[PDB]
């Protein structure tokens, strides 16, 4: 109120705002490397996926799409990229 630095918002201030209402737009999504226990291939999956991702080698359902994010199958591990 009457004194606020618009040029330099705090890092927690900019992660609380809407993604479009920030000083510079930035998505809330990310890509991840996922691995199923049965098969050794590593698959790149978008966090907010809209399609069922099947393992090419062994036809394993890696994830199921939902309203907001795609949920990984039980026993599958993932790590964020960069």
């Amino acid at each position: 109120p009457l004194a606020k630095d618009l040029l330099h918002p705090s890092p927690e201030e900019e992660k609380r705002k809407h993604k479009k209402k920030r000083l510079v737009q930035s998505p809330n999504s990310y890509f991840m490397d996922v691995k199923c226990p049965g098969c050794y291939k590593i698959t790149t999956v978008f966090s907010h996926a809209q399609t069922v991702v099947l393992c090419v080698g062994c036809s394993t359902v890696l994830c199921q799409p939902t309203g907001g994010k795609a949920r990984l199958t039980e026993g599958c591990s993932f790590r964020r990229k960069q």
Partner: protein, 129 residues
């Protein structure tokens, strides 16, 4: 929809000036807006401003000094001849000792006194005092 960007920028600046704020954020940016703010800053009404560069149309953060009474836009942009300028000065400015009308001429964007010195007309953009 939004059809005038300078109008929104000037309205935001005026509203923030009335509330005693120290800084204003105006989006989207425009080179006409930058020229208008430069004209205002040369006379000491606003102060330094910074252009934030996203990859889409930019934004501006403007510092305020408390010296601005009213900044406004004229719509539509009427053609002003050099002999009709005194009528607009009488209609829009509060006194003959201060206040400026902003014009876009073929020489550039300037105030009415600088347009008298350079002996040219143009189109009226807005005013501030």
């Amino acid at each position: 929809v939004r059809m005038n960007v300078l109008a929104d920028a000037l309205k935001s600046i005026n509203n923030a000036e009335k509330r005693g704020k120290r800084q204003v954020l105006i989006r989207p940016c425009s080179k006409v807006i930058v020229r208008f703010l430069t004209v205002m800053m040369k006379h000491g009404y606003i102060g330094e401003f910074e252009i934030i560069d996203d990859h889409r149309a930019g934004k501006i953060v403007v510092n305020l000094t408390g010296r601005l009474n009213k900044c406004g836009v004229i719509s539509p942009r009427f053609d002003v001849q050099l002999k009709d300028l005194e009528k607009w000065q009488n209609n829009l400015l509060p006194s003959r000792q201060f206040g400026f009308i902003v014009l876009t001429t073929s020489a550039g964007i300037m105030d009415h006194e600088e347009a008298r010195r350079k002996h040219t007309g143009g189109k009226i953009l807005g005013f501030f005092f």
